[PDB]
Amino acid sequence: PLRDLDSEHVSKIVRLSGIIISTSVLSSRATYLSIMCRNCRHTTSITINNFNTGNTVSLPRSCNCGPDPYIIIHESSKFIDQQFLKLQEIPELVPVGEMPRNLTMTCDRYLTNKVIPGTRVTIVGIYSIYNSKNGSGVAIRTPYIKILGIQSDVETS
Amino acid sequence: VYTSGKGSSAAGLTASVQRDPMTREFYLEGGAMVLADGGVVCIDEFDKM
Amino acid sequence: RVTLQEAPGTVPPGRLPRHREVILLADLVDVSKPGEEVEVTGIYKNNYDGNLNAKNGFPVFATIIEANSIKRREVFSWTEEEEREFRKISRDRGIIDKIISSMAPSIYGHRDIKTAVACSLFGGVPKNVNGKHSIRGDINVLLLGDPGTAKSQILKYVEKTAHRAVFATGQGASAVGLTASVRKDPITKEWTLEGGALVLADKGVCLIDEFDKMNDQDRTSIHEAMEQQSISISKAGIVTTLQARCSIIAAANPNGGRYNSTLPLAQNVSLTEPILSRFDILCVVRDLVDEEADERLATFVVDSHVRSSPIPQELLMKYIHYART
Amino acid sequence: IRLSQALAKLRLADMVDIDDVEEALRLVRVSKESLYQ
Amino acid sequence: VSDKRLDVDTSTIEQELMQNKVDHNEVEEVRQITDQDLAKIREVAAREDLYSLLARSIAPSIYELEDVKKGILLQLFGGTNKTFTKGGRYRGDINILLCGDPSTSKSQILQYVHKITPRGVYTSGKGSSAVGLTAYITRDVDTKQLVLESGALVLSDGGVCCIDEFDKMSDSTRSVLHEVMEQQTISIAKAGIITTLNARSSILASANPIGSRYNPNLPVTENIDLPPPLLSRFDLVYLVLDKVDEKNDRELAKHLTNLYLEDKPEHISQDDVLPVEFLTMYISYAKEHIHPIITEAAKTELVRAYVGMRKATTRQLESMIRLAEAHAKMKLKNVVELEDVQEAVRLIRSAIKDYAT
Amino acid sequence: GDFLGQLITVRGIITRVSDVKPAVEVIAYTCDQCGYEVFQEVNSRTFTPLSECTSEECSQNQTKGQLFMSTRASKFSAFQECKIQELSQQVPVGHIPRSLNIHVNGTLVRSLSPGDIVDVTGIFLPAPYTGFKALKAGLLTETYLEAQFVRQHKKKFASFSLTSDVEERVMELITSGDVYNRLAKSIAPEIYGNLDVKKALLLLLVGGVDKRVGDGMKIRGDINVCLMGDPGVAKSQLLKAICKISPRGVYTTGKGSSGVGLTAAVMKDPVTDEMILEGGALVLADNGICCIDEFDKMDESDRTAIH
Amino acid sequence: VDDVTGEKVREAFEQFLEDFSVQSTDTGEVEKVYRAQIEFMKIYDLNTIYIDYQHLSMRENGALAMAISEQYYRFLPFLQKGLRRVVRKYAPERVFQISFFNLPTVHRIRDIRSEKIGSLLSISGTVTRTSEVRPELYKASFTCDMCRAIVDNVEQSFKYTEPTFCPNPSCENRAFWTLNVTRSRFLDWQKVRIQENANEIPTGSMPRTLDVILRGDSVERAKPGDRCKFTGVEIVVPDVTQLGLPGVKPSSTLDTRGISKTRSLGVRDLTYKISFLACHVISIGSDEINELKEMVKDEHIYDKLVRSIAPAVFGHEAVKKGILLQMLGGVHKSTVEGIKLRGDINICVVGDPSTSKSQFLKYVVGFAPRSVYTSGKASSAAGLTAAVVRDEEGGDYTIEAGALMLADNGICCIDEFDKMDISDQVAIHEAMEQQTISIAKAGIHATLNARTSILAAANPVGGRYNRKLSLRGNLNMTAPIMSRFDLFFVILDDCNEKIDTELASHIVDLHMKRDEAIEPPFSAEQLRRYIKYARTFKPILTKEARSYLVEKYKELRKDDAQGFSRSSYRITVRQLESMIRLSEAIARANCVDEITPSFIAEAYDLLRQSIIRVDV
Numbered sequence A: 001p002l003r004d005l006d007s008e009h010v011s012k013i014v015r016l017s018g019i020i021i022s023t024s025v026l027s028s029r030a031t032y033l034s035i036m037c038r039n040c041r042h043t044t045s046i047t048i049n050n051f052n053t054g055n056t057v058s059l060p061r062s063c064n065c066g067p068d069p070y071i072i073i074h075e076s077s078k079f080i081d082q083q084f085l086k087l088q089e090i091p092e093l094v095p096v097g098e099m100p101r102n103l104t105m106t107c108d109r110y111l112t113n114k115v116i117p118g119t120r121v122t123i124v125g126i127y128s129i130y131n132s133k134n135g136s137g138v139a140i141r142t143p144y145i146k147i148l149g150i151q152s153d154v155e156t157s
Numbered sequence B: 001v002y003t004s005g006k007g008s009s010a011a012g013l014t015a016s017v018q019r020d021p022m023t024r025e026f027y028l029e030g031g032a033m034v035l036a037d038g039g040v041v042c043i044d045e046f047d048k049m
Numbered sequence C: 001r002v003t004l005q006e007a008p009g010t011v012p013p014g015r016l017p018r019h020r021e022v023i024l025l026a027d028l029v030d031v032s033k034p035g036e037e038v039e040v041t042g043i044y045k046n047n048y049d050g051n052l053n054a055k056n057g058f059p060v061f062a063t064i065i066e067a068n069s070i071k072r073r074e075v076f077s078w079t080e081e082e083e084r085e086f087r088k089i090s091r092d093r094g095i096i097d098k099i100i101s102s103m104a105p106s107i108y109g110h111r112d113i114k115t116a117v118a119c120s121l122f123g124g125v126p127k128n129v130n131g132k133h134s135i136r137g138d139i140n141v142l143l144l145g146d147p148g149t150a151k152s153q154i155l156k157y158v159e160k161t162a163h164r165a166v167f168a169t170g171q172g173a174s175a176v177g178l179t180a181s182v183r184k185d186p187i188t189k190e191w192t193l194e195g196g197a198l199v200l201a202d203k204g205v206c207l208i209d210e211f212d213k214m215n216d217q218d219r220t221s222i223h224e225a226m227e228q229q230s231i232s233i234s235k236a237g238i239v240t241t242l243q244a245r246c247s248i249i250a251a252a253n254p255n256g257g258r259y260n261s262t263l264p265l266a267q268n269v270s271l272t273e274p275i276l277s278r279f280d281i282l283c284v285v286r287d288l289v290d291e292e293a294d295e296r297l298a299t300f301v302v303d304s305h306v307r308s309s310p311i312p313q314e315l316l317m318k319y320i321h322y323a324r325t
Numbered sequence D: 001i002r003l004s005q006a007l008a009k010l011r012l013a014d015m016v017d018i019d020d021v022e023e024a025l026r027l028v029r030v031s032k033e034s035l036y037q
Numbered sequence E: 001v002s003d004k005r006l007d008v009d010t011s012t013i014e015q016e017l018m019q020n021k022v023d024h025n026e027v028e029e030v031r032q033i034t035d036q037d038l039a040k041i042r043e044v045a046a047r048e049d050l051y052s053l054l055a056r057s058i059a060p061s062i063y064e065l066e067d068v069k070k071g072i073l074l075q076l077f078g079g080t081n082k083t084f085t086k087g088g089r090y091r092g093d094i095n096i097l098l099c100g101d102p103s104t105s106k107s108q109i110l111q112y113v114h115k116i117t118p119r120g121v122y123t124s125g126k127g128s129s130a131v132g133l134t135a136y137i138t139r140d141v142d143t144k145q146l147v148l149e150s151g152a153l154v155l156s157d158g159g160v161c162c163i164d165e166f167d168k169m170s171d172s173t174r175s176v177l178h179e180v181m182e183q184q185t186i187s188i189a190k191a192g193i194i195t196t197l198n199a200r201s202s203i204l205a206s207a208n209p210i211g212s213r214y215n216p217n218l219p220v221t222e223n224i225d226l227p228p229p230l231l232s233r234f235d236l237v238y239l240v241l242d243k244v245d246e247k248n249d250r251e252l253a254k255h256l257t258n259l260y261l262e263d264k265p266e267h268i269s270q271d272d273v274l275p276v277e278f279l280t281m282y283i284s285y286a287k288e289h290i291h292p293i294i295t296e297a298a299k300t301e302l303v304r305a306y307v308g309m310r311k312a313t314t315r316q317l318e319s320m321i322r323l324a325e326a327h328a329k330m331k332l333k334n335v336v337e338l339e340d341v342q343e344a345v346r347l348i349r350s351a352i353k354d355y356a357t
Numbered sequence F: 001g002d003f004l005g006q007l008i009t010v011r012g013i014i015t016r017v018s019d020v021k022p023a024v025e026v027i028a029y030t031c032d033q034c035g036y037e038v039f040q041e042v043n044s045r046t047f048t049p050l051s052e053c054t055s056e057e058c059s060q061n062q063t064k065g066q067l068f069m070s071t072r073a074s075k076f077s078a079f080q081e082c083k084i085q086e087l088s089q090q091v092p093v094g095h096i097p098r099s100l101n102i103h104v105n106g107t108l109v110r111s112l113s114p115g116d117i118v119d120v121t122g123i124f125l126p127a128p129y130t131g132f133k134a135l136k137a138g139l140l141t142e143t144y145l146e147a148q149f150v151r152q153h154k155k156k157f158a159s160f161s162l163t164s165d166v167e168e169r170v171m172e173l174i175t176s177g178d179v180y181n182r183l184a185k186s187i188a189p190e191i192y193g194n195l196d197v198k199k200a201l202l203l204l205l206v207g208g209v210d211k212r213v214g215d216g217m218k219i220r221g222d223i224n225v226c227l228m229g230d231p232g233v234a235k236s237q238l239l240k241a242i243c244k245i246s247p248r249g250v251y252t253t254g255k256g257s258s259g260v261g262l263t264a265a266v267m268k269d270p271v272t273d274e275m276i277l278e279g280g281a282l283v284l285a286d287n288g289i290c291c292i293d294e295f296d297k298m299d300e301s302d303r304t305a306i307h
Numbered sequence G: 001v002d003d004v005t006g007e008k009v010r011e012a013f014e015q016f017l018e019d020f021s022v023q024s025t026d027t028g029e030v031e032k033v034y035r036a037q038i039e040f041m042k043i044y045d046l047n048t049i050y051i052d053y054q055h056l057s058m059r060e061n062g063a064l065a066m067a068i069s070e071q072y073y074r075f076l077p078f079l080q081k082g083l084r085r086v087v088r089k090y091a092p093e094r095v096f097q098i099s100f101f102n103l104p105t106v107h108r109i110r111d112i113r114s115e116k117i118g119s120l121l122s123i124s125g126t127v128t129r130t131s132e133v134r135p136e137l138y139k140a141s142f143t144c145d146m147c148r149a150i151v152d153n154v155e156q157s158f159k160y161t162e163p164t165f166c167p168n169p170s171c172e173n174r175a176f177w178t179l180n181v182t183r184s185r186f187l188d189w190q191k192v193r194i195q196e197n198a199n200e201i202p203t204g205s206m207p208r209t210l211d212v213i214l215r216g217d218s219v220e221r222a223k224p225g226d227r228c229k230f231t232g233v234e235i236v237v238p239d240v241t242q243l244g245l246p247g248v249k250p251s252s253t254l255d256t257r258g259i260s261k262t263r264s265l266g267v268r269d270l271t272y273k274i275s276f277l278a279c280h281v282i283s284i285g286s287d288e289i290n291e292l293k294e295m296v297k298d299e300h301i302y303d304k305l306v307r308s309i310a311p312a313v314f315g316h317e318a319v320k321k322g323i324l325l326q327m328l329g330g331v332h333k334s335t336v337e338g339i340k341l342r343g344d345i346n347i348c349v350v351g352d353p354s355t356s357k358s359q360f361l362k363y364v365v366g367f368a369p370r371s372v373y374t375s376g377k378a379s380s381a382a383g384l385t386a387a388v389v390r391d392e393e394g395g396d397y398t399i400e401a402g403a404l405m406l407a408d409n410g411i412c413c414i415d416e417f418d419k420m421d422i423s424d425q426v427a428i429h430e431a432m433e434q435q436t437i438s439i440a441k442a443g444i445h446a447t448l449n450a451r452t453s454i455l456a457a458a459n460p461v462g463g464r465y466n467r468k469l470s471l472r473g474n475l476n477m478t479a480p481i482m483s484r485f486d487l488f489f490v491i492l493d494d495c496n497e498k499i500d501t502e503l504a505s506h507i508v509d510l511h512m513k514r515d516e517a518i519e520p521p522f523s524a525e526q527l528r529r530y531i532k533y534a535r536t537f538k539p540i541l542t543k544e545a546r547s548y549l550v551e552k553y554k555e556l557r558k559d560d561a562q563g564f565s566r567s568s569y570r571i572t573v574r575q576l577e578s579m580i581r582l583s584e585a586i587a588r589a590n591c592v593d594e595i596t597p598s599f600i601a602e603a604y605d606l607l608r609q610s611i612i613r614v615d616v
C-alpha cells in the first residue's frame, strides 16, 4: 500500500500500485558527452551509462588553466529523455480523514510516454531519496521512486 | 462513453476550451463528444441537458 | 509531524486553543489519526532552525514537543473465538427484530424507519451477471423527514456504527462536498485529485441530508453515481472513471409544512420524480398530534434531559461487518 | 438662452441680438414637431 | 485649518483636540472672532425678520422655495448634544430628503451646502457601495502594507453628507443607512479589525419620483417609492411641486434670465439685504456658544402636536424636538419659547400643504 | 529594429503618458572638508551614491573626507514617459496594434496627453534590458524612442495666443458672409439632408458661455444633443463625423463601453508611482464632445453616470 | 560620575523601599509595607513583585519619582540590582521583575509621542490577537569550540548577537558563536497587539493599533477582546519595512578618521518604529453578600428585575424577560453518552421600525461584559469567525479573535439578519447546530469552540405586518436557522391615545436633562454582581412534578393541532426541549433549586403569548 512505506525499503526494489495524477514535460539528460578544455584545447569524453536525479556526474575541474574549463560540445553529444511521473494513491481509499499522499517518479528512455495520466498502474521501482530544498528540517530528505519498470493495468483502456 | 447529463460529474458534455493553469495557453478540456470520437456515445435525460 | 492543538472541550471561556507542534519517530509514525484526542508523553524542546538570524528582535526560539509515546482516546475485527461464539446467536429467528430495536436506541424512533436503516446498512448482493451488468447490490434509503422529526439524528447513528460511512451534509460545506474534482492544494503544492463523498465512501455507506438545498452541480453528480455506480472525471488533464458503489441514505425535508398536501409524495416534496425513482425505500414520517404518542415521546425526551433486550452496540457493529464480508 | 448665446458667438457678437434668440426658438421647435408629418 | 469662506467645525466633536493641543500648545484650530463684530452679531439677532432673512441669504441664486432653504438653515444649526451619564448621544443630527419634479434646483442646494459645510462629502447614486461608504482595508502600495482607509461616511462624520439620486441606490446599499440614522454610529466587524466606529453626520438626500412628475393623486407615500419604514425615518421630508403660477414663471425668468448683466457676476439677488461672510461667523458662533433647552413650556403643545399627527410614527416627535431646538438655538435663546414650536411643526406640515394635490 | 540611433518621425495615438517627475542627470556632493564638489554623471535607471572623497585635495591624504549630496546643486531634468500605439488604420489586415515607449526631457514635457493622434519626432535610442534572465540570448536592447519635437494632428483649442495672420485664414471664411449656414452645411457633408441637424451640431461644437455666479456655483456651459429615429437616416455617421472633426472627441458605444469604461479605475503606475486613477470615455474626453451609439442598450449603471 | 549619580539614585530608591512605606497607624496595615511584600512573595517563592507608584511619588516630594519616570530605562538596572541587594540582605535561581502600578495619569495611544520614549507611561486599550508564548535568551552560554564553551553572559539588549569579549582563546577574536541550547536562561514571552478603545477615536481618523510585548509573569494576563490598562516600560523596535516613506532617513556610516590607510564602508540604516512594552497588566474597565441575601430573600425581586431591566425602553414586558433569560442560561451539560444537550437560549426580535427594538440591543452591549455588537449586513463574512491569521511571522497559525467567537459563553447581538444574505447565515447555523466553529484556510486546519447566545433584530419583508400572513413567511430567513431560535417575541406598535400620550411624555422626558430622575429599583451596577451570583447555581430538577410538564407540553399542542392555520410550527418537540432551558432559566432567576411547577407555568405562558402573537 502506498500509505505504508517503511524506511527499511530504501534502495530496495519496491512495487506498488496507484493512480497517476500528472505526467510532466520531457527533459533531456546526457548519456554521452564529449568535452573540451577551452584554454588547454584538450578534448575528452564522459559517458554516463546509468543514472537515477543524483546528480550523477559533473564536469571535471582540471584541464591554471582552471577553475573548471571544460566546455561541453553539443554537436557530438548524445542525449536521452526523462519524464517525472507523479503517482497518487487511489482516491477511493483509505484516507477517510485526509488529503491522500503521493510519490514522485522518474522514468528514463523507453519508459516514457507509456502512460497517460488517469491510467491505473502498478509500478515496480527502487524506493529512494533526494535532498532538494526545504519547502522541513532537520536533515529530512524527501522520498521518490526510481521506476524500473512499469507494468500497466490491462488495458485498462 | 456513457454520459447522462448535463455531463457528469466533472466531465462537460461537449467540446470545451479550458486553459492550462500553468503555461496558460489553451487546450481541449474534454467532454463526452471529443473523448468518444469515432464511435458510440450514450446519452440519458436528453431533454434535461 | 503532527500539529496538536488544545482539546476544544476543556477550554476556559474566551481564550483560544493553541497549536503546539509534535514530532513522531520510529514505530510511532502514522499510528494516530486526525479527529481524535491523542495523548503524547514527550520531551518539550525549544529546537530548532534556529536561524532565525532573521529574528533578531527580540531573540525568540520556537518550541516543539518531541514525542516518545501515543495514547488513544480515551482496530475492530472478528475473531475465531468471537465468531464461533457469534454463530450461535444468529440462529434464533427473532434476532432480526432485536437488531432493529438495537439500531437507533436514543431516538425511540419507529419500527419502520429503523427497519429501513438496518436493511440498507446491512447489505445486499452485488451481483454481476456474467459478464455484463451487476444490477445493484445496495439499498438506497430516502428518509423523508419533517421538521422536528428525528430525521437528522438517525443517519448520524450510521456514521458511528458503519465500517466506512461518510457524512457530506447538504453542501456549503461539511467536507467532503459530494463532487469529485481536481483542486489546487493548500499552501504551495502540486495538484491532488480528490473524490467527493461518493468515491471516498465506496463499498461503505454514503450519508447525505437536505437534498432540497443542493445546488444542481451536485445533484447531477449524485444522479450519475446512482445510475452507473461510477463517477467520471475529465478535468484537468486527468481522465478517469472512479468507482463509487455506495449505498445512499438521505434525509429530505418536505416542502413547507409537516405534510404539505394530500397530494402525492412527488408533489409533496421538491425533488423531481426521476431522481426519486432511484430510491427503493421511502420512509415517510408523520403525524398529527396524538395524545398517547405525545405522552410516550415526552416521557422519553424528558427522561433523557433529566439524566445528567437489544444487542450490545459493539457486537452488532461487528455483526454487520462480519456478515457483509 | 444658452443656444442663443451660442448663435451669438458665430456672429462674434457681444450684442446677442433678437434674431439670434428667435433663431434659437426656431431650432427648438423644428427639433420636434416633425412628428406631425 | 480654519477658513473664512466655509463654515466652522463644532466643539463637541473636537473635544480632546481642544483638551489636548493646549498642553504642548500649538496655533490656529478654532476660528477666532474680534469684539466689535460680535457686537454686530448680537445686534443683528435683534432684527425680527432674521429667521426669514437668513433663509433668503443661504441660496442667493436659488429663487423662492424658501422653506427648503429654511429647513436646511436649521440643518446647519441642528439639534443639541446629550451624553447623559454615559451613552445617550442623540447628537444634533437632523436629516432631510427632498423630492419633486426635475430641474427644481434640488441638486444646486446640494452643491451649496457641500461648499459651506466644513467636512461634508458628496456622493452620487450607483457610484456607491456599502464597502465604499466605510472601511476599505486597501494595500498601501508605498510600503507594500495593508492600511485602513476611512470610508465616505466616516469622513463625513460631523457636518453634512450630501447624496444624489438616493432613490436609485442599490438594495445592498441603504442597508448601511438603517445603521447610521438610528445608532448614529457604524458597526464594522469585517476582515482585519472589529470595532464600532462613530460617524455622526447629517444627511441631505435628493430623490426623483417615478413620474418623474409625481403627478396629482396616487398615494404619495407610494409615489416616492422607497420602503415606507425608511421613508418615515427622515426628519423632514420635502416634496416640491409646480402649480404653474403664471405669475410665477415670469418672475422666475426675471430672476434667471438676468446675468445677462453683469457678465462679471454682481448684485445677484439685489436689491435684497444679504449677509455674506457674516452669516458663517454668525452660524459658527450660534453653534459653539449656545445650548438650548426646551424647559417646561414646550411639552404640552409639543405632545399635542404629535398626537394630532398620530390621530406617522414616534420618530416624528423626536424630529420636532430636535428640529425645533435648532430654531431656538438660533435667536440666541438658551431656552425655547412656547412659541417657535409652531413653525417647527409647520415645517412638517409645510409638506402636507404640499401633500394635498 | 535597424533604425536604432536615427532621427525618426512617427504617427500614432498617445496613451498612458505618466506624471512628470525630476530625474537626475548629474549629482553634486560637497566634501565639506576639502571643500570642492563632486559631480557624478548618472545613467540608466539606477546608480550607487559615492562616498569617501574624490577631491584632488582629499586624494593621497591620510584621511579622506566624507561627502553628501545637495539637491539644490545637482542638475535635474523633467522626465515624462509616454506610449504610442498604431493609428489602427495602418495595422495590417490581421494582427493587432503594437505599442512603443517614448521619453521626454526638459521643455517638451506636458505637451502630450492621452487620446491624441500625433506626429512625434525624435532621435531613436536603445536602453539595456531583457526579459527573464534565462530568456536572453544577448545582448538585445529592448529600445525606446526619444522625443525632440511634437506635432499634433487636430490642433487643440482653446489655447492659442495669436491671431497673427491666422485671422487671415479666418477671413476667407468670414468675408463671404452667412458663416452659420456655410459651416452648418460644412459639417459632415458626406451625408445628404438634415441641414437643421447639422445647423445645431455647429453650435454643439462651439458651445459656451457657461457662467459663474460669483459665490460661486456654475451653470453649464454647453449643449447636449440627442438623435432619435430608426433604422436608417444615417444618424451615427454624423457622430463619426463630429468625433472626427472635434479635438478631444471620443466615440463610444454601450456594450461597447463598460461602466468601468467611463469611470476611472485605480491601477498601479509602472516606473513613477503609484496607483493612479486612469479613466476612459467621459474623463478621457472632456472639454470636448463625447459621442454615444446604441444609447438604449447601455442598461442601467451607465445611465446613472450620464444622468 | 554618571555612574555615581545613577548609583546615588540606586541608594535613594533602596533606602525608599527600606524606609517606611506606610504612614497608617493604629488599626492596619501598620507600616511597613514592602517588606511584608517581599516575604509574602517568599511564601510561594515565585520571584516577582508588585509595588505601588503613588507612595513613591509622594515620599521624596517626587524628585525621585520624576528621576524614575523620565530616565526609567536608564534606571532599570540600578533598581532590580537594588532589589537583589535587599533580597540578599534579608533573604536567602535568580529572576526578578519589578512592576509599578496605579499611575496618576492615563494617556491615549494616539497621544503617545517620542518625548516619552524609554520612559514608563500608562496606556489603556482593547487587546487583540494574542500570540502563543515563546522563550527568550537575555542570558546565554555561547562560545566557540576553541578553546572552551560555557562562557555565559551578555546579549542583554535585543541583538541577538554576540559574545562581547575574551575570545576565543587562544585564537583570540572576533570570531563568533557557537550557541548552546543546553545552557542558558529563558523567560516568557507572548506578544499581543493592542488597539485604541472604540469609543475614543477622533473623527474620522479611524483606529490605529500598536504592538505590546509581554514578558514577565505578566504573561497571559492579557485577554483577547478586552479593555486593559498598562504601565510603561515603553521602548522601541526597529523596522525594515519603512522605505519610500519618504525620507530624509538617518544612517550609520562610520567615522574612520582614526587609524590610517595603508571593513569597507559598513553602512546600516536605522529606522525604528514605536512599540509599547508591558511590565504590568490589569483588566480594569462580605459587606456585599448581605445585599445579595437581601435580594434572594424578597419575593418580588423577580418583578424588580423585569421592571428594572431597560429604563430607556417603555414597556412591552415581554422582551424584558426575553433579554434577561439569555443572561441566565440552562445547564448546557450532560446527558452523554453521547451528544450534549442545549442549553443556552436564542431570541430574534421582529417588528415595524421605530419600535426601538435596537434600544434593547444597545442596552445589552452596554450592560453585560463579553458582548459583541455588530450591525451586519456589514459582518462582512468573518467577522463572525476566525481568519486565521497567517503569517506571523515565525510559524504563524495565530488566530484572530473575532466578532462572534470573541464573545463566548455570552450574548452576541446582531441587527438585521435579513440583510446578511446567504453566506454568513449558514455559518451562524453551523454555530448554533454543531456548536463548534471549524476553520480551515489554505493552511493549518482547525477547530475552535464557540458556545454562545445570539440575540438578533430582524425587520419584516415590508417592515410591516402582514398580520394575516404566517410568521413563517414574514421573517424571510431560511428554515433551519429559523427553527433554532426560540422564540421570537414579535412586537408591533399600534396607536392608543393613552399609550401615545405616555410615549410622547416619556420621550420628551428622556430628552430633558430634568427630569432624568427616572430610576430602576435596581442600579445597573449591582444587577451584575447579583446575576453573576445567580450564575454559580447548578439548577437541577429531579422533582417528579416534572411529570406535570409532560401534560403541559401535551396541553400545548392539542389545542394547537386544529387548525393548522394557527401559529404552527407543529408544535415541534424542540419546543418541549425548549421548555426545559426556559425552566432552568427561571430557576437561575429565582435562585430556587429543583424549581416549582409554577415557574414552569410561567415559562409556559410566556411561550404561549409568543405563540398567540403569531396567530392573528
Ligand SMILES: Nc1ncnc2c1ncn2[C@@H]1O[C@H](COP(=O)(O)OP(=O)(O)O)[C@@H](O)[C@H]1O
Binding pocket: C106, C107, C108, C109, C145, C146, C147, C148, C149, C150, C151, C152, C153, C209, C251, C253, C297, C301, G480, G573, G574
Ligand atoms: N422522538 C424523538 N426523540 C428524541 N429526539 C428527537 C425526536 N424527534 C426529534 N428529535 C431530535 O430533534 C432533532 C430534529 O432535527 P431534524 O429536524 O432532524 O434536522 P433537520 O430539520 O435539519 O433535518 C434531531 O436531531 C433529533 O435528535
Ligand SMILES: Nc1ncnc2c1ncn2[C@@H]1O[C@H](COP(=O)(O)OP(=O)(O)O)[C@@H](O)[C@H]1O
Binding pocket: E061, E062, E063, E064, E065, E101, E102, E103, E104, E105, E106, E107, E108, E252, E256, F219
Ligand atoms: N427657483 C430657482 N431659482 C434659481 N434657479 C433655479 C430655480 N429652479 C430651477 N433653477 C435652475 O435650474 C437648474 C435645476 O436643475 P436641478 O434641479 O439640479 O435638476 P434635477 O431637479 O433633475 O436635479 C439649476 O441650474 C437651477 O439654477
Ligand SMILES: Nc1ncnc2c1ncn2[C@@H]1O[C@H](COP(=O)(O)OP(=O)(O)O)[C@@H](O)[C@H]1O
Binding pocket: F190, F191, F192, F193, F231, F232, F233, F234, F235, F236, F237, F238
Ligand atoms: N442623407 C444621406 N446621405 C448619405 N448617406 C445616407 C443618407 N441617409 C442614409 N445614408 C446611409 O445610411 C447608412 C446608415 O448608417 P448608420 O448611421 O451607421 O446607421 P443608422 O441608419 O442607424 O444611423 C449610412 O451608411 C449612410 O451611408
Ligand SMILES: Nc1ncnc2c1ncn2[C@@H]1O[C@H](COP(=O)(O)OP(=O)(O)O)[C@@H](O)[C@H]1O
Binding pocket: E178, E182, E314, E315, E318, G312, G313, G314, G315, G351, G352, G353, G354, G355, G356, G357, G358, G359, G507
Ligand atoms: N419604547 C421606547 N423607548 C425608548 N425609545 C423609543 C421607544 N419607542 C421609540 N423610541 C425611539 O425610536 C428610536 C428607535 O427606532 P427603532 O425602532 O430602533 O428603529 P429600527 O426598528 O429601524 O431599529 C429611538 O431613537 C427612540 O428614541
